[PDB]
Design a protein around this ligand. Structure first.
Ligand SMILES: [K+]
Ligand SMILES: [K+]
Ligand SMILES: [K+]
Ligand SMILES: [K+]
Ligand SMILES: [K+]
Ligand SMILES: [K+]
Ligand SMILES: [Mg+2]
Ligand SMILES: [Mg+2]
Ligand SMILES: [Mg+2]
Ligand SMILES: [Mg+2]
Ligand SMILES: [Mg+2]
Ligand SMILES: [Mg+2]
Ligand SMILES: [Mg+2]
Ligand SMILES: [Mg+2]
Ligand SMILES: [Mg+2]
Ligand SMILES: [Mg+2]
Ligand SMILES: [Mg+2]
Ligand SMILES: [Mg+2]
Ligand SMILES: [Mg+2]
Ligand SMILES: [Mg+2]
Ligand SMILES: [Mg+2]
Ligand SMILES: [Mg+2]
Ligand SMILES: [Mg+2]
Ligand SMILES: [Mg+2]
Ligand SMILES: [Mg+2]
Ligand SMILES: [Mg+2]
Lengths: 129, 343, 247, 205, 211, 132
RNA sequence: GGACCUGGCGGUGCUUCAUAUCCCUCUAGAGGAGCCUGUUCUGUAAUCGAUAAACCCCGAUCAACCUCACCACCUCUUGCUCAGCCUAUAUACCGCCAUCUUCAGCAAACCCUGAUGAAGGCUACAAAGUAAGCGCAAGUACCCACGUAAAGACGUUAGGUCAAGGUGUAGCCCAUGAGGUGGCAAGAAAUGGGCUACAUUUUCUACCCCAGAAAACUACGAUAGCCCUUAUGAAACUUAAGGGUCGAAGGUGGAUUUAGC
């Protein structure tokens, strides 16, 4: 919760999604019931902290694997990386570490979206002529 | 009295006695049961015993461009109508009596082995027509309850598979047996294992494992050997697509332990390509029917080792006394190698 | 009933960055309030109530728990205690619903004049099944007429007369007004109570505003709602049950 | 109750209202501005602002009332107060100038002192111990002391020992007896206190 | 672990006994198995803290001389109040002195208890009096003041039967004179499969002025 | 537990009409009366005869339009006119509904010696208020 | 036989509770007397059902004939009915209800944990639950937003009712059906509920609350007993009302127990 506000802003700024609140049972494994039969689930879940507030693995780590969602996760020395697809060993507590991660992911995500637009635009201009 | 008469629904609800202390706890059993019959089914508005022909109700209103008048069927003409309705009533009873018999399972009164069909189509236009469902266990579980005493629920174990390596199983629980079938078969389709098959007919190597107290020993077999395995394993193997295998179940014969013990062992089998990649050597198959011809079944994708595999003069592998006793002709059983139907 | 709009487009991407919380509107509000509290730090009752959960659940168009409601309110109070500016005040007032406080001040009857020009007021009172209508004259000698009879002849019971005395005595006006009242229904005590209420209401036209509030606080201007309760079937009375038979 | 909890009980006291504002404290000023916003119950028919109102006698009258017959209950009370006053005026005229100073002729002063002389300071409670009942002494609250004094006085006058004597003569005679620390009701007080002393050992319970 | 259970999944959770936590709690929530343990042990800690303050002269000279002994100390689960019990003395005169000093000390003691940062949030301590049967001394206070005034049907029930009523009853008469088997539930037979294996056979355009 | 005229909760598959879904205590609160006449007003006579006639007309129309009635009958009396308002299904051919209207109106007019009219409202299917 | 789970139970622990409520406290009662009425038992040729809480002025907002279903005698046989049966089974039922309920929970469809065991699924600075629907609630009725009604799910007691009516199953059909005449229903007793009393806060009269008399063997006290008249009816020692006569137990009721905010 020290970084809930920071993370939610980073998600909105990059045009992505954040879930920093209490994780209710079945958000991923029962999404069609909770959201609707046509709900689209995430294609990638990025964990800036892999543990919940009682020092157990975040339920979404297990449930992400169940739904065949790749997971990126910062894994500190007390975390379990077994089910994280792309683990990144690093400090998850220090404000400087977490701020760095948010800049890197925010920048990586924003750069890729602009690259996608550049290529598409070029591919269309060349297509007409 | 006309005013003491009731509707058909009221009369059947009373006569059937489906609500009551008899039907609450199944305190009453029904070898002979009153069956509801719709008595308005074959009845035509306007038709009565007297055989009157009312224009516009039971006969056409206009005949030859002129309005018909009130008429009455002759006594003989009415007997035919009455007889025809009785025959039509027995024909309807016989059409319902003619119901297609369904194939039995492992036994006549057993649920195990019976097909339940493909899982239901998912909400998002998902379909599973390629999958077949088989029942493995149907149990009556009795729960002691604080206020209602012993209640009866159903626990079902079903396995699903497409016959091409993809198979899974799930437990279903519900008060009704047919709701449990739906839960189990629909849930199992989301918990599918992929099982690798050698030449799409058998396992890649002998598999011997223990799950809890259930031991399962499986042997790779050649084509034409068939499925000589526990009837439950036979059922599961047809769903996976294994045609030739020997299996022996020892210890506790618990269906659930056997099912998940079987799926755990079949999902952790190393293929020949994995063996070649792990050891960086060729996998060469020697078949006695093909003589000394060496058949390379798998070659490593990465570099190929130059150092031969060490030849330990004597392997330190643990052997099964049952397998050894058989090879030495010291195994005597009247039940082994018995003639059985094709499986 | 108001219907929530689609929460994603054709490509399936949710519109709101908090979609996957399941409470995007609630958590978007908490996110906005938490952010304002931070900016203040970087920079540095009677007529209103907080909206109820059922009104918050409509501004957001979502379902909320009771603890969800509390956490949001605890966060707004934390925003008032700070040096909130104008921008931080229009926001809080969106969640303050004005609580209308009813006036308890007694309504004063008009002062009328008769053919002879004597000022008087008229009011009514009810006690049980008794209904009274009293005419209190501004000036008089203390005469009270009940259905044309002297009050001590109509009310031979001393307690019924003490009830007639109470309104005038409480404001120190014994022997200063003449009363002519009519009462019907009820018993002797109920009729005296109805006259007490009728006279007090009419007497309020001739006393100061502070005296009218003292009569109100003494229970002299409140209609007694205590009426006979119906008998219920299966029991001896309104409350008494039939004897629980010996077991 | 047909009154919602929002309804507050009425305060019937002329003095409380005429009290000047300056004498008021900041706490008493808040209570007065608060009641202007509160709902007030209608005053019961029993109590009024009359200067002759006595809440104790009104309570004694209700404890003597049988089946809602307040007229008879009130009649018996006023007949008792007249009987006490006449008995004292007869005792006064027949006495010497010295004794006259010690003779009380106010029936309200006699009534109150008669009851105060019957209030039991300590009482007993029946307790169960080992399948056996033993009474335990306990202090009595003020409400209970005043209740018992009235109940004992009314009970004694209703005793069948009195043959054909009207209630105003019985009650008036008992009040004047208790006024002088004499009578059966005073004995009931003395015995209750005496029984408490015996059961002091059991007071640990 | 020991027979005393310590398997709680949220063993790393930070115990937060405060008045604000009680308000921000699910109403459905009920105390868990090992939730009472922390309460039982936290109340014991308060007893330890209070006992040392009483016997150390530095806290207060008046308190030390009193030599007060705490009979019981149990906090409330609400987190609004704390119940502490001290043993009364024989002399009611002495009891007044102890209560008076304790009543005024409590306010300072609360601040002294805040010195222990672990228990910094200490609800106001309610120094109840018990262990000395204070009522019994209170009763004697009234007993001496109190004014005592001038000082000086059938044996049939015992038998256990109503022998008389029965004797009359016989006399009145004399006046006129002169199991099944229950099947095991698991073995109860069903026909659902036979009905299943027998078979289950329960078995558009619109026009104006049709013909 | 009270039983009178209460459709009991089931598994959510039982369609009930507005009338069937409201127990007796909702009569005059959420649902009206199925017959309107003056016999039950204070100072009015012949309540017994109107009641028997209503019981017959309900049974008569149930068996005269078998399987066609989609709801309870509403019986209205004005003067000596008797109006029967029925919600029926759209399964029977229109010729059969006209025959039964002519047949029922005439037979009932001679039976009770009053001008009787039958008003039919057709619905494609029974109107469902809720699924109990 | 081992281990575990559920339920039940514990002369099982702890904490908090019950608001007319388990105990004490408050008021009037019941338990004693007579009478009214129900039940039991006994009696009778002479119904039935309810019958611990949740039966006992209960089905009955009602039995002189009728009602009536009972007993005795006599009579009828396609029978008021395209017959009939108050015959058995409420442990086949519908219908309508009691009870906890002076409760707040039930629960389809999903999801997840326990290795996919029987089972379990809450933490708000939150840790796997989401939950339609039903109930509570809301709303409505009565004089308010109060109170009282009404409502009160699932389930528990194979609870009550085949004798409200209907009805499955079995049974009777010259009788287990139908009609007629007369008759039963008492009290040796026991017991539940109620009424009236034992009196002076009373009794009688006037009055409807400022009165006069009464007040212990001619008082208080029967709505009982006996006699007479009347009302209803075809029929009244019987049912009701009134009068006359009569003037009893009863002297404020042990253990125990009921109701009321
Ligand atoms: K247990
Ligand atoms: K009694
Ligand atoms: K039943
Ligand atoms: K029946
Ligand atoms: K039957
Ligand atoms: K009684
Ligand atoms: Mg860390
Ligand atoms: Mg067979
Ligand atoms: Mg009463
Ligand atoms: Mg009820
Ligand atoms: Mg008695
Ligand atoms: Mg019986
Ligand atoms: Mg029975
Ligand atoms: Mg019973
Ligand atoms: Mg007869
Ligand atoms: Mg008879
Ligand atoms: Mg018969
Ligand atoms: Mg039953
Ligand atoms: Mg209300
Ligand atoms: Mg009710
Ligand atoms: Mg409600
Ligand atoms: Mg039974
Ligand atoms: Mg017969
Ligand atoms: Mg008499
Ligand atoms: Mg006559
Ligand atoms: Mg006499």
């Amino acid at each position: 919760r020290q970084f809930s506000y920071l993370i939610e802003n980073m998600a909105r700024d990059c045009g992505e999604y954040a879930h920093t609140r209490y994780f209710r049972g079945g958000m991923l494994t029962n999404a069609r019931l909770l959201f609707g039969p046509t709900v689209r689930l995430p294609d990638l879940i990025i964990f800036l902290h892999t543990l919940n507030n009682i020092f157990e693995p975040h339920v979404a780590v297990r449930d992400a694997a169940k739904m065949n969602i790749p997971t990126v996760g910062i894994v500190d020395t007390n975390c379990n990386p077994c089910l994280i697809t792309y683990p990144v060993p690093g400090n998850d507590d220090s404000p400087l570490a977490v701020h760095l991660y948010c800049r890197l992911f925010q920048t990586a995500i924003t750069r890729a979206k602009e690259k996608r637009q550049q290529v598409e635009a070029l591919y269309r201009l060349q297509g007409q002529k | 009295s006309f005013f003491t008469k009731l509707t058909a629904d009221e009369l059947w609800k009373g006569a059937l006695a489906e609500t009551g202390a008899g039907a609450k706890k199944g305190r009453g059993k029904r070898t002979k049961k009153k069956k509801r019959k719709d008595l308005n089914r074959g009845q035509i508005i306007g038709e009565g015993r007297y055989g009157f022909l009312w224009p516009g109700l039971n006969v056409p209103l206009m005949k030859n461009g002129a309005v018909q008048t009130i008429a009455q069927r002759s006594k003989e003409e009415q007997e035919k109508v009455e007889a025809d309705m009785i025959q039509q009533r027995e024909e309807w009873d016989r059409k319902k009596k003619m119901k297609v018999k369904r194939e039995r399972g492992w036994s006549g009164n057993s649920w195990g082995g019976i097909s339940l069909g493909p899982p239901d189509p998912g909400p998002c236009g998902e379909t599973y027509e390629d999958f077949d469902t088989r029942i493995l266990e149907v149990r009556n579980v009795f729960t002691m309850t604080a206020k209602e005493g012993r209640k009866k629920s159903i626990r079902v174990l079903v396995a699903v598979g497409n016959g091409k390596g993809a198979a899974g199983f799930s437990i279903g629980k519900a008060t009704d047996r047919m709701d449990a079938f739906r839960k189990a078969k629909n849930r199992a389709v989301h918990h599918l294992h992929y099982i690798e098959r050698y030449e799409d007919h058998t396992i890649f190597h002998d598999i011997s494992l223990r799950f809890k107290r259930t031991h399962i020993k499986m042997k790779k077999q050649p084509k034409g050997y068939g499925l000589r395995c526990h009837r439950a394993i036979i059922t599961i193997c047809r769903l996976i697509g294994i045609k030739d295998m020997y299996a022996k179940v020892s210890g506790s014969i618990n269906m659930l332990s056997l099912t998940q013990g079987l799926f755990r062992g079949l999902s952790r089998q190393e293929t020949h390509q994995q063996l070649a990649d792990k050891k960086g050597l060729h996998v060469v198959e020697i078949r006695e029917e093909c003589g000394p011809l060496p058949i390379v079944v798998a070659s490593p994708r990465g570099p190929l080792r130059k150092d031969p595999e060490p030849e330990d003069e004597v392997p330190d592998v643990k052997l099964d006394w049952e397998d050894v006793k058989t090879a030495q002709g010291m195994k005597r059983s009247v039940w082994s190698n018995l003639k059985r139907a094709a499986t | 009933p108001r219907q929530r709009a689609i929460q994603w487009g054709e490509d399936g991407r949710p519109f709101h960055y908090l979609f996957y919380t399941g409470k995007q509107s609630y958590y978007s509000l908490m996110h906005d309030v938490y952010g304002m509290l931070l900016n203040l730090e970087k920079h540095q009752v009677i007529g209103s109530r907080w909206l109820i959960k059922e009104e918050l659940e409509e501004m957001l168009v979502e379902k909320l728990s009771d603890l969800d409601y509390m956490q949001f309110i605890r966060l707004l109070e934390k925003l008032l205690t700070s040096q909130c500016g104008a921008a931080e005040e229009e926001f809080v007032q969106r969640f303050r619903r004005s609580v209308t406080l009813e006036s308890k001040k007694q309504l004063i009857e008009p002062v009328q004049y008769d053919e002879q020009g004597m000022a008087f007021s008229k009011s009514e009172g009810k006690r049980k099944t008794a209904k009274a209508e009293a005419i209190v004259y501004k000036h008089g000698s203390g005469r009270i007429k009940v259905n044309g009879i002297d009050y001590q002849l109509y009310f031979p019971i001393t307690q019924d007369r003490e009830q007639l005395m109470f309104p005038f005595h409480f404001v120190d006006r014994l022997g200063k007004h003449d009363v002519t009242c009519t009462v019907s229904g009820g018993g002797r005590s109920a009729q005296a109570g109805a006259i007490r209420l009728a006279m007090a209401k009419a007497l309020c036209s001739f006393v100061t505003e502070d005296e009218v509030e003292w009569m109100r606080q003494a229970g002299l201007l409140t209609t007694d709602p205590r009426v006979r309760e119906r008998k219920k079937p299966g029991q001896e009375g309104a409350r008494r049950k039939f004897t629980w038979k010996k077991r | 109750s047909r009154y919602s909890p929002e309804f507050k009980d009425p305060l019937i006291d002329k003095e409380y209202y005429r009290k000047p504002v300056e004498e008021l404290t900041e706490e008493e000023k808040y209570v007065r501005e608060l009641k202007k916003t509160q709902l007030i119950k209608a005053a019961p028919a029993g109590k009024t602002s009359s200067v002759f109102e006595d809440p104790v006698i009104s309570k004694f009258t209700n404890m003597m009332m049988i089946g809602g017959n307040k007229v008879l209950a009130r009649s018996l009370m006023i007949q008792t107060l007249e009987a006490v006053k006449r008995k004292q005026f007869e005792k006064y005229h027949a006495a010497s100038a010295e004794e006259q100073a010690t003779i009380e002729r106010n029936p309200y002063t006699i009534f109150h002192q008669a009851l105060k002389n019957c209030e039991p300071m300590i009482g007993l409670v029946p307790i169960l111990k080992g399948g056996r009942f033993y009474q335990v002494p306990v202090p009595l609250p003020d409400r209970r002391r005043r209740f018992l004094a009235m109940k004992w006085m009314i009970t004694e006058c209703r005793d069948k020992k009195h043959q054909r004597t009207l209630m105003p003569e019985k009650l008036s005679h008992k009040l004047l007896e208790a006024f002088h620390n004499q009578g059966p009701v005073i004995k009931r007080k003395h015995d209750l206190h005496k029984m408490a002393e015996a059961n002091r050992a059991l007071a640990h319970y | 672990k020991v027979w005393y259970e310590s398997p709680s999944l949220g063993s790393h959770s930070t115990y937060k006994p405060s008045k604000l936590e009680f308000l921000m709690r699910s109403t459905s929530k009920k105390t868990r198995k090992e939730d009472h343990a922390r309460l039982r042990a936290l109340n014991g800690l308060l007893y330890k803290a209070l006992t040392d303050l009483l016997c150390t002269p530095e806290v207060s000279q008046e308190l030390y001389d009193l030599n007060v002994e705490l009979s019981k100390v149990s906090l409330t689960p609400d987190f609004s109040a704390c119940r502490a019990y001290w043993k009364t003395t024989l002399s009611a005169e002495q009891n007044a002195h102890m209560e008076a000093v304790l009543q005024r000390s409590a306010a300072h003691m609360r601040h002294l208890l805040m010195s222990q940062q672990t228990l910094r949030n200490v609800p106001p301590i309610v120094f109840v009096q018990d262990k000395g049967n204070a009522a019994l001394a209170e009763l004697d206070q009234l007993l001496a003041v109190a004014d005592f005034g001038p000082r000086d049907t059938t044996s049939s029930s015992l038998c256990g039967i109503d022998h008389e009523a029965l004797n009359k009853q016989i006399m009145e008469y004399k006046r006129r004179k002169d199991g099944r088997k229950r099947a095991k539930p698991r073995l109860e037979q069903d026909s659902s499969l036979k009905s299943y294996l027998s078979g289950e056979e329960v078995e558009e355009y619109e026009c104006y002025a049709p013909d | 537990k009270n039983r009178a005229a209460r459709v009991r909760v089931s598994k959510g598959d039982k369609p009930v009409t507005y009338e069937e879904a409201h127990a007796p205590h909702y009569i005059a609160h959420r649902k009206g009366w199925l017959s309107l006449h003056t016999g039950n007003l204070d100072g009015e006579d012949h309540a017994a005869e109107r009641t028997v006639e209503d019981v017959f007309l309900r049974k008569f129309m149930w068996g005269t339009f078998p399987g066609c009635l989609a709801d309870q009958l509403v019986l209205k009396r004005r003067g000596n006119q008797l109006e029967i308002c029925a919600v029926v299904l759209r399964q029977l051919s229109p010729h059969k509904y006209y025959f039964l209207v002519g047949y029922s109106e005439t037979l009932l007019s001679y039976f009770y010696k009053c001008p009787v009219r039958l008003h039919l409202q057709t619905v494609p299917s029974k109107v469902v208020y809720k699924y109990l």
